[PDB]
């Protein structure tokens, strides 16, 4: 059930933000020059 | 033994290692950063040391394993196990 | 005079991956230099590793552990996977 | 058979997070370490009724 | 050839004879050249597909050295693999510092 | 009247004292349990010889001293006496890491 | 709507919008991402949810059921 | 009224222009007479092939660009936009030279 | 006679543009020139060593590539 | 009699020749290569022995500690440039004191 | 329990007596010298192997060692090493 007690770090935890996260996989990277220069110049 | 032995390095020890490097005044985060760099270094070495040991069919790590482990990285540790 | 290169093989693998995009001659020479360099890498590491074990024989074990220690965990993991698959399927 | 969790230590800080009764962060200080824990509003009410103060076990 | 029965591309005989005349060891195993051709074919396939998509991004049907340059530099395992390698006609990455903006 | 040195005087004599000593500045047991801790999640139930530990600790100390020298020079480039977290990153990444 | 939650992001109130969050519900046949509805975010922050558990969210009821 | 850009505007478009170009920024003849000049006092009466000169110039350019990047970061560590003589020495010696 | 001056100041400025440098001081053009003067010696010396060992009066591309091989630079492309 | 005495050498030529034969280097080995290698190795070893020897003479000790060899190699430019990555155990560091940190 | 091992000990001691026959050498420093000579052996030998491979030759002679020692060492150490080396080899081959 719901835990009445919750352990919290002073520096790391904030009540503002709540974040939860878990052949060869590779993150998709765009090789376009105008895309990277467009991202950096905006 | 199995729990948070990276804290075993004392802050005065990092201060003495800073004295060896000629550092006068030291900030706060230096003791954390140097600890993390050591944590990465010991992995980068010990990993290869376990690789050679596993290839040599041994349950015990010797000095030739450490020296030959630092040989391919260009450090070439002399003295023990030369 | 004659010379040896990987050209036809790189073109065949290119047809195995993307049988549309072509390859320039200079990039093909760069790939030839890459494969020729990695050959000396793995071969030399297998020579030193064979010298550390006091053995005059180089087998698939030396290539397996060598490839493991000279490559990142991903490339060594998949390289050992597909390599052992091809060798075990061959023998 | 059941297992129960127990927290004990000297209180360092007490703050309200304040409709609804807001939670409270407790600074309980063990002898062998220090840990902070967020609490329910009800257990906060029980804490306020026990007249606890900073530095009380 | 024994490369087709094992599902390979590069010849096993050239690598085996090359290792024999390469002055490496006295005895050579029969599985070592097959293993080496497997690893080299895997890495070559990786470079060919990464540089291939790098050519697909710029809408060109040929692979220029710049596509391979960005393909190797954008990958972490390839950048860590070869950090000293200098590619000709590959250029550099469009790295722009934020403080200069 | 108590006798107290001004701040910065003991640092110099400490540099003179430690730069003349070749002894190891890290204790044996913490480095032992640390190396064993790193070796726990790699291969379970290993053994470490009485040697090869002073080689890891020796290379770690000798390398870290040079890192403190290059980082010290990086702090001097900023015209101050204090080493900062960004100095370790500068002198680190600038060495090819 | 039920499935594994791999990634759930929740953001504090900003001037642009009351709350912005995106939860990723992964299932074997289909995997899609939903943008939460405010009080939905109050239900996800109300009871602590850890990524990687299978839950069943009730749209009409407005409560979450962890299977 | 003449049309003049403020100082610092042309540098950005020059960065955009040259960072998109793979061409060599050094002329062939000065590098030729320079390489021959260095080869005069080593072995007298040598010969240079039409190739291998673009390899020396190519490695020199590609290496010097990276040196200007690391030196640029060294100048950023000092919190300014200007590269200085001490920055080249910092980013040079800190690379192991 | 003095071919090290063959490198123009706008050339060093363009090489600085390749590195992302905005404003450049005066002594940069001298320092970069000296570093180049040392580099060309550090390479060309080994290039003459291999050429003298190969019994040749002409320097080829394999001499330059093999000269940069032992220094860890490993120049690709020409003469691979 | 060994061939090292007639050529004015110290290290044995046979051990180096057989070591190069079993070292898996090339198919054919010349007879002057081991003598040349023993000459170079004897010259370098003599250099390290005399430099570390005078380094022991400076501290007024009749034995050579690793610190004497450390300072002997670091104080020489050709030895420091020869091995820049070599880590010597129990050699310590050099008494390098920065000027800006002085009063 | 031990079979046998090979080191440079006696030779380092003899050269020590040739230079300064007073100061002794510690065992650890002797091991450091053994590691040094053992390392330089693999250095010059490997460079001679690659240099022999660049010339398309299966034979390694004193030429490969001479040029190799020249290119892998500073001008002073390579100059004196080639000097005394060629002196010892030329004096050796003259005995026949």
């Amino acid at each position: 059930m719901k835990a009445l007690v919750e352990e919290i770090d002073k520096k790391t935890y904030n009540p503002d933000i709540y974040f939860t996260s878990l052949s060869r996989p590779v993150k998709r990277i765009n090789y376009s020059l105008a895309d990277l220069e467009a991202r950096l110049y905006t | 033994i199995l729990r948070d032995n990276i804290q075993g390095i004392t802050k005065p020890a990092i201060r003495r290692l800073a004295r060896r490097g000629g550092v006068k005044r030291i900030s706060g985060l230096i003791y954390e950063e140097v600890r993390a760099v050591l944590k990465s270094f010991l992995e980068s070495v010990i990993r290869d040391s376990v690789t050679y040991t596993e290839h040599a069919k041994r349950k015990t790590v010797t000095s030739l394993d450490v020296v030959y482990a630092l040989k391919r990285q260009g450090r070439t540790l002399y003295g023990f196990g030369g | 005079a004659r010379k040896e290169t990987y050209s036809s093989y790189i073109y065949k693998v290119l047809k195995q991956t993307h049988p549309d995009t072509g390859i320039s001659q200079k990039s093909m020479s760069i790939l030839n230099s890459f494969v020729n360099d990695i050959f000396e890498r793995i071969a030399t590491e297998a020579s030193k590793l064979a010298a550390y074990n006091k053995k005059s024989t180089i087998s698939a074990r030396e290539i397996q552990t060598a490839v493991r220690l000279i490559l990142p965990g991903e490339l060594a993991k998949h390289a050992v996977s597909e390599g052992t698959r091809a060798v075990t399927k061959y023998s | 058979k059941e297992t129960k969790e127990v927290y004990e230590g000297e209180v360092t800080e007490l703050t309200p997070e304040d409709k609804t009764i807001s939670h409270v962060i407790v600074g309980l200080k063990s002898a062998k370490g220090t840990k902070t824990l967020r609490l329910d509003p009800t257990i906060y009410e029980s804490i306020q009724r026990e007249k606890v103060s900073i530095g009380d076990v | 050839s024994r490369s087709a029965k094992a599902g390979l591309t590069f010849p096993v005989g050239r690598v085996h004879r090359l290792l024999r005349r390469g002055n490496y060891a006295q005895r050579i195993g029969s599985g070592a050249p097959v293993y080496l051709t497997a690893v080299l074919e895997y890495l070559a396939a990786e470079i060919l597909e990464l540089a291939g998509n790098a050519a697909r991004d710029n809408k060109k049907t040929r692979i220029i050295p710049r596509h391979l340059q960005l393909a190797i530099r954008n990958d972490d395992e390839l950048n860590k693999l070869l950090g000293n390698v200098t590619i000709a006609q590959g250029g550099v990455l469009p790295n722009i510092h934020q403080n200069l903006l | 009247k108590p006798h107290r040195y001004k701040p910065g005087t003991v640092a110099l004599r400490e540099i003179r004292r430690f730069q003349k000593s070749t002894e190891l500045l890290i204790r044996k047991l913490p480095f032992q349990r640390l190396v064993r801790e790193i070796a726990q999640d790699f291969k379970t139930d290993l053994r470490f010889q009485s040697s090869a530990i002073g080689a890891l600790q020796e290379s770690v100390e000798a390398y870290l001293v040079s890192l403190f020298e290059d980082t010290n020079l990086a702090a001097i480039h900023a015209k101050r006496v204090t080493i900062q977290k960004k100095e370790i990153k500068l002198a680190r990444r600038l060495r090819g890491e | 709507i039920e499935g594994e939650v791999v990634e759930i992001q929740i953001d504090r109130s900003i001037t642009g919008g009351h709350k912005q969050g995106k939860l990723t519900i992964k299932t074997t046949d289909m995997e899609t991402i939903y943008e939460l509805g405010n009080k939905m975010i109050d239900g996800l922050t109300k009871e602590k949810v850890l990524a990687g558990d299978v839950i069943s969210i009730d749209k009409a009821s407005g409560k979450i059921t962890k299977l």
Side-chain angles (χ1 to χ4, degrees), chain A, chain B residues 2-82, chain C, chain D residues 1-17 20-57, chain E, chain F residues 2-97, chain G residues 1-65 67:
Chain A
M1 212 182 180
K2 177 184 178 181
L4 303 179
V5 182
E6 172 184 348
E7 187 174 359
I8 267 173
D9 196 336
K10 290 184 176 180
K11 300 180 181 179
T12 299
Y13 164 85
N14 209 27
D16 293 28
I17 303 182
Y18 176 81
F19 179 79
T20 49
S21 61
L22 182 61
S23 61
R24 159 185 158 82
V26 50
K27 299 182 179 181
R28 297 301 180 179
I29 301 179
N30 298 329
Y31 303 86
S32 181
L33 177 57
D35 180 35
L36 295 179
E37 292 198 13
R39 285 172 55 184
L40 297 183
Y41 282 138
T42 42
Chain B
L2 60 143
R3 299 278 75 180
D4 293 330
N5 287 114
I6 192 59
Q7 299 291 341
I9 299 94
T10 62
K11 176 179 60 60
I14 303 296
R15 179 176 299 272
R16 295 175 297 182
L17 295 173
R19 289 295 182 268
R20 288 289 295 270
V23 186
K24 183 177 180 299
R25 197 174 302 262
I26 297 93
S27 180
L29 304 179
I30 304 302
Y31 310 109
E32 300 180 358
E33 187 71 20
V34 173
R35 185 180 296 101
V37 177
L38 232 301
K39 184 178 61 178
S40 178
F41 187 88
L42 289 187
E43 293 182 1
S44 295
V45 181
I46 285 176
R47 179 54 191 266
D48 298 331
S49 79
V50 174
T51 300
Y52 287 159
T53 306
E54 184 65 28
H55 180 69
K57 284 293 183 299
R58 293 181 179 180
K59 298 298 298 180
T60 306
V61 181
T62 60
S63 58
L64 287 312
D65 199 316
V66 173
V67 178
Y68 295 160
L70 297 182
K71 163 69 65 174
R72 51 96 58 181
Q73 295 181 358
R75 290 154 186 170
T76 313
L77 190 265
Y78 279 172
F80 327 97
Chain C
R2 195 184 177 182
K3 65 179 180 300
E4 181 182 0
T5 179
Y6 301 94
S7 61
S8 60
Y9 313 104
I10 301 178
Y11 193 83
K12 289 180 180 180
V13 179
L14 173 68
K15 291 301 178 181
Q16 293 179 359
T17 306
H18 297 292
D20 41 30
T21 298
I23 298 179
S24 61
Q25 182 68 20
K26 177 174 177 54
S27 179
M28 181 179 299
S29 179
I30 297 180
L31 296 176
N32 180 25
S33 312
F34 175 79
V35 180
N36 187 25
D37 179 87
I38 303 301
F39 177 82
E40 298 292 337
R41 293 293 183 87
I42 310 183
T44 303
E45 180 65 26
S47 180
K48 295 183 178 181
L49 189 61
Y52 287 161
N53 297 123
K54 305 300 179 180
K55 300 180 180 180
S56 301
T57 308
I58 296 184
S59 60
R61 168 204 186 102
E62 317 293 330
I63 309 297
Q64 189 265 0
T65 47
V67 161
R68 285 187 65 91
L69 73 101
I70 69 183
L71 298 183
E74 189 74 14
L75 300 180
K77 181 181 82 286
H78 293 273
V80 163
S81 179
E82 189 271 345
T84 49
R85 178 181 179 180
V87 173
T88 46
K89 191 186 65 178
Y90 168 76
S91 300
Chain D
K1 52 187 65 178
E2 53 97 357
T3 62
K4 57 181 52 164
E5 306 175 12
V6 167
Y7 299 99
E8 55 183 358
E10 174 185 351
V11 178
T12 61
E13 302 179 10
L14 289 176
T15 307
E17 293 195 344
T20 171
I21 307 101
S22 297
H23 302 61
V24 156
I25 303 175
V26 194
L28 317 95
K29 174 200 304 178
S30 177
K32 202 155 61 181
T34 52
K35 294 183 185 178
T36 62
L37 299 91
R38 185 184 184 179
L39 289 196
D40 197 84
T42 61
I43 177 176
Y44 159 58
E45 180 178 0
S46 70
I47 280 183
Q48 179 173 332
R49 297 209 170 275
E50 293 285 60
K51 309 174 186 176
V52 327
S53 57
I54 288 179
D56 293 29
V57 177
Chain E
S1 61
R2 58 265 185 91
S3 301
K5 58 179 59 60
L8 271 301
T9 300
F10 301 92
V12 186
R14 298 292 179 88
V15 180
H16 188 57
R17 188 264 303 179
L18 225 175
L19 289 175
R20 176 185 293 101
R21 292 303 304 177
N23 299 120
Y24 295 109
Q26 302 293 149
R27 199 71 61 91
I28 302 299
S30 180
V34 183
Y35 209 97
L36 183 53
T37 51
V39 178
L40 290 178
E41 181 171 345
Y42 175 79
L43 271 303
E46 182 73 20
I47 305 297
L48 282 183
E49 62 181 4
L50 291 183
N53 180 75
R56 280 295 190 90
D57 203 331
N58 288 332
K59 300 179 179 299
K60 293 185 177 181
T61 70
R62 285 181 170 87
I63 296 180
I64 61 180
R66 185 179 181 271
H67 299 164
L68 179 137
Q69 170 70 9
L70 273 68
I72 295 184
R73 293 287 85 90
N74 285 330
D75 187 27
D76 300 331
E77 287 73 15
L78 295 180
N79 184 24
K80 183 179 299 300
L81 174 59
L82 311 174
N84 302 330
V85 156
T86 294
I87 297 297
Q89 296 289 344
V92 297
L93 293 83
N95 298 330
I96 307 170
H97 191 60
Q98 185 177 1
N99 301 120
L100 299 180
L101 301 179
Chain F
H3 185 262
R4 294 176 56 95
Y5 286 151
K6 58 177 60 181
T9 301
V10 192
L12 273 66
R13 58 181 298 184
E14 282 181 357
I15 290 180
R16 303 180 184 96
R17 181 179 181 180
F18 287 99
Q19 282 186 349
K20 293 175 181 295
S21 61
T22 61
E23 64 176 2
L24 295 82
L25 303 182
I26 305 180
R27 310 299 292 269
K28 303 302 180 301
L29 273 302
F31 194 79
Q32 183 83 27
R33 300 175 298 181
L34 179 56
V35 170
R36 293 184 178 272
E37 182 194 25
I38 305 300
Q40 279 182 357
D41 53 325
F42 285 161
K43 187 67 62 179
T44 60
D45 297 330
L46 281 182
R47 293 299 181 183
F48 283 93
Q49 197 181 358
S50 179
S51 60
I53 305 174
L56 294 175
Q57 183 176 345
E58 182 70 20
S59 61
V60 154
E61 290 177 1
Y63 160 77
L64 192 54
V65 170
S66 60
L67 190 143
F68 267 94
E69 293 184 1
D70 299 331
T71 310
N72 180 27
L73 298 179
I76 299 167
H77 180 74
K79 265 62 183 301
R80 56 177 184 260
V81 308
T82 68
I83 176 187
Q84 205 170 351
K85 181 181 58 60
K86 58 181 180 180
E87 310 288 350
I88 303 181
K89 297 183 178 181
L90 183 72
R92 180 178 60 182
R93 185 180 301 271
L94 281 186
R95 285 178 60 181
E97 305 180 10
Chain G
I1 298 183
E2 56 184 352
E4 302 179 355
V5 9
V6 244
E7 303 165 352
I8 289 190
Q9 180 181 349
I10 285 171
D11 159 52
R12 184 54 174 181
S13 182
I14 330 186
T15 309
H18 169 74
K19 274 182 182 177
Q20 291 197 28
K22 6 209 58 184
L23 104 158
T24 302
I25 303 178
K26 163 191 169 300
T27 61
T28 303
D29 295 344
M30 175 173 51
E31 178 180 0
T32 52
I33 298 183
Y34 297 83
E35 298 190 9
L36 274 74
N38 181 17
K39 302 178 183 64
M40 292 287 306
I41 310 181
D42 300 25
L44 268 67
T45 53
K46 189 66 174 304
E47 40 168 64
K48 246 191 175 183
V49 284
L50 213 165
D53 70 325
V54 183
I55 65 178
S56 177
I57 299 183
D58 307 341
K59 295 174 60 180
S61 302
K63 83 160 191 174
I64 307 96
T65 299
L67 290 181

